[PDB]
Design a protein around this nucleic acid. Structure first.
Lengths: 194, 146, 63, 103
RNA sequence: CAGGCGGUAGGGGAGCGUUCCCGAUGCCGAUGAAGGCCGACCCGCGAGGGCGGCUGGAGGUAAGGGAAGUGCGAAUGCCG
RNA sequence: CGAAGCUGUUGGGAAGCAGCGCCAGAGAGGGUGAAAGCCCCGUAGGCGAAAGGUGGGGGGAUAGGUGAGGGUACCCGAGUACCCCGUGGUUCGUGGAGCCAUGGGGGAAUCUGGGCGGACCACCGCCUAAGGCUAAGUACUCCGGGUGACCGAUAGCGCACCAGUACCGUGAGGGAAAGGUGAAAAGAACCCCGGGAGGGGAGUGAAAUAGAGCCUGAAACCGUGGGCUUACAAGCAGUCACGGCCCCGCAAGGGGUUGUGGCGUGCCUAUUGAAGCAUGAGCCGGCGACUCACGGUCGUGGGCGAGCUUAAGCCGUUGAG
RNA sequence: CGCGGGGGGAACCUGGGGAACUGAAACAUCUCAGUACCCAGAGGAGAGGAAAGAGAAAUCGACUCCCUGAGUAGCGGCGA
């Protein structure tokens, strides 16, 4: 990648004689991404629901209307249906796909050119426009949109607000934005996980 | 790919439903002559019949309904030769099963069909098929003991 | 809420690995006859040729 | 609403993001933020009595609440509020500046 | 080209609008969005969708797929 | 402490564009006369806590507590266990029904002792009640905070406008509608009609179809004014045929609405059976009812595949894992 | 004389009294339940707790909270 010490790389190890199953890629990815969103939805009715005033008028006769339970089947705020309910259904899976997925994508994103550095120096691993000296001297610029992972807290209080890119620290999975984007870099072949 | 018409690999459909309208089947239900439906619904399993539901039978199995438990005899099981014919190393009753397939056992009974590579596989109770497969054709162990 | 198999049915019947409903009929247990001269024997255990393969369901958690 | 705005009279000067010119501000209160510094075009058409100036209406006034202000910069660009470790009267005693502590 | 063609229930195929998602540190918009009166042009078989004028005065959401208190003549229903 | 430019021109007004300047571990948001990072409060970050006092950890730590091996040889939690019946619980409705409290009487023992492995004798094995204390790891919520595929005030909390107030009730208690000018009231001065009311010019004013039952304001309803129409007449009432009369399109014809005439049993239920004096529909707006939990079943895009999946947690998580 | 303590607190504690309907497509045994409610002391925890256990193993080792075991073992007009 660089010019300072080395100048050469590239790999398709993962499993290149395959890397062609978009079908499943679509389905699952979408599903988990949703999950998270703090689901705490309310509910109102059942039997009493805040102990009701206790019935009313007779029936046979009544004020013209065979009905008389203050279950409140009409008040805008009374005996309806349980659409929501706290449990916003929490479903999920393992690394069986955590890997396979990021593979075909970036691998295809390499059929467009991604980049990978793995480890380097940008400057004072803190200031915005310090890393800028690494934007016009690296190559990248406004359009394709890029993502990158570096586990050093130095880069953390450095990348701050990332207009155009990601800025990560530990081990997440933000292909989301990368799907609608491209460019990338990793923290050692070790971090991707062996 | 990206964010372009991700239309979920062919067959996708959320196949919900709805209240009603005036376009077809919709906004009906379907029945009447048989009075189903209940605000606190039937269930609805197979409680119907209303005819002893072909349950004019009788309990035969007398291996239950006591009070504390049931019979207790350490894992009584078996095996085949075609399942691990693979390799050997030693074919130990834990090298395999303790690591891989099949659960616990104080009494391992050997058998199956096939005809693979035989050799001193430990066992706690054998089957004669093995005996001839390993009488100048293989080697065997002993049993439990404690 | 989790659904619990009917022990009653499980306390009696058996399913043949491939979806089948069989157990020992109804007649020769004790033999309400008395006279003693024929019949007494002649019987075994069959299935149910219509709806039983549906009953099996409520016993697919214990077997 | 956090009870926190700006200075007072002393000097002060308006801008021109709605009116124009400049003046030494008159009576900026605090509560809803509001204030009126002599300028602007306002007057109430109040009731016609004798208690008032006589005729119905009134006179002077302004109106506003958030930002839209300025201070003393005859030639130099524009800064704000300086510092110290051990300088002027005790350690304080400020009043807007050019380049030092006073000007 | 033979074919088929009312069709309550019913069970199949699609689609149609309609509120919250991300695409939204994206894009139209006071050289009007939302609402609404008018249409007798453009497409939908329809579901609906557009488009243009005018009133109207701060927000809206692509393609896209993601959720669904929704698809409302009435029930001597409930309210005004 | 807080970061970091304007200016011009049209434009009510510039947060409209442009030519270019900028801080940035602080481009979360909230706002200032029309869709602003650099504009008021803040947003990464860290200074910091008190005098008042006040809730508590680490530190130190005081009265309160902490050896062993062997021979002599008496003593240790009673009307208690143990019987019984009448037992409640334990999954246990007596069932072969053991174990705890026992309600009722009977009623011992003290380590070579005393309870139990669900009856009772024979071998085996763990415990010593009948005095009692004992935090954590746990529950819960008005309210502090955040955030909410929480709602936006005919929702919703019952009520955000002073409601647990109007009102009703004997009591008990039952229980309400009612958010919204504008950017700023800056809220109409004056003169003419005039009872105060209500009006009109005119004025503040971007707009008074912005004006005080003030945002935008539809529907049932209400006619002034407009055009097509009606007194020879049989009507679920609309339709279509031609034709006629006033509107736009040079035109070809496009309207409206009826004149005669052929056409005309409506509807939502319910049902061998309907048009329907067999139900219901005062009328319009708005609100209105099969989701979901977890479980089960059979299908579907599918990954891996004799293999195929991990529950709650420990760390990490703005956020992810 | 000393402290208590009465008295108050939204759920949540413990305990002491503690029903019926609806299910069983009748009903008395079982159901909902030891739920609802009433009484009582209580503390932000409570309550519970150091073995006269479990339970078959030449075993484990205070009591409590979750995870499963198994909805099996079983209770039971062993019917619901």
């Amino acid at each position: 990648i660089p010019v300072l010490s080395p100048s050469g790389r590239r790999e398709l190890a993962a499993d290149l004689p395959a890397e062609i199953n978009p079908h499943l890629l679509w389905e699952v990815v979408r599903w988990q991404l949703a999950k998270r969103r703090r689901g705490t939805a309310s509910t109102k009715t059942r039997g009493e629901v805040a102990y009701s005033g206790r019935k009313i008028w007779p029936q046979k006769h009544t004020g013209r209307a065979r009905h008389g339970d203050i279950g409140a089947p009409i008040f805008v705020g009374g005996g309806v249906v349980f659409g929501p309910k706290p449990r916003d259904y929490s479903y999920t899976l393992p690394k069986k796909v955590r890997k396979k997925g990021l593979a075909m994508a970036v691998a295809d994103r390499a059929r467009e050119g991604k980049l990978l550095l793995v480890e380097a120096f940008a400057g004072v691993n803190g200031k915005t426009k310090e890393f800028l000296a690494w934007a016009k001297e690296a190559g990248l610029d406004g359009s394709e949109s890029v993502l990158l992972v570096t586990g050093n807290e130095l880069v953390r209080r450095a990348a701050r607000n990332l207009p155009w890119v990601v800025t990560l620290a530990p081990e997440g999975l933000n292909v989301y934005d990368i799907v609608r984007t491209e460019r990338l870099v990793m923290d050692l072949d070790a971090w991707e996980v062996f | 790919d990206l964010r372009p018409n991700p239309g979920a690999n062919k067959r996708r459909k959320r196949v919900g439903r709805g209240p009603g309208s005036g376009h077809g089947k919709t906004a009906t239900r379907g029945h009447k002559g048989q009075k189903s439906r209940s605000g606190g619904l039937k269930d609805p399993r197979r409680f119907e019949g209303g005819r002893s539901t072909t349950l004019m039978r009788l309990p035969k199995r007398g291996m239950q309904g006591q009070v504390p438990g049931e019979i207790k005899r350490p894992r009584y099981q078996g095996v085949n030769l075609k399942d691990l014919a693979r390799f050997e190393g030693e074919v130990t009753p834990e090298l395999l099963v303790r690591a891989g397939l099949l659960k616990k056992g104080y009494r391992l009974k050997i058998l199956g069909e096939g005809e693979a590579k035989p050799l001193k596989v430990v066992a706690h109770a054998f089957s004669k098929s093995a005996l001839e497969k390993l009488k100048a054709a293989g080697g065997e162990p002993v049993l439990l003991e404690a | 809420p989790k659904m619990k198999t009917h022990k009653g049915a499980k306390k009696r019947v058996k399913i043949t690995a491939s979806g089948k409903v069989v157990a020992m009929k109804t007649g020769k247990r004790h033999l309400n006859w008395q006279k003693s001269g024929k019949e007494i024997r002649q019987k075994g255990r069959k299935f149910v040729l219509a709806k039983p393969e549906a009953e099996r369901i409520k016993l697919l958690l214990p077997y | 609403m956090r009870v926190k705005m700006h200075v007072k009279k002393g000097d002060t000067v308006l801008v021109a993001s709605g009116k124009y010119k400049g003046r030494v501000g008159k009576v900026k209160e605090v509560l809803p933020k509001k204030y009126a510094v002599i300028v602007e075009g306002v007057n109430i058409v109040k009731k016609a009595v004798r208690v008032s100036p006589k005729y119905p209406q009134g006179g002077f006034i302004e109106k506003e609440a958030p930002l839209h202000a300025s201070k003393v910069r005859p030639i130099c660009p524009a800064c704000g509020k300086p510092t110290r470790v051990r300088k002027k009267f005790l350690e304080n005693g400020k009043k807007i500046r050019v380049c030092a502590k006073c000007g």
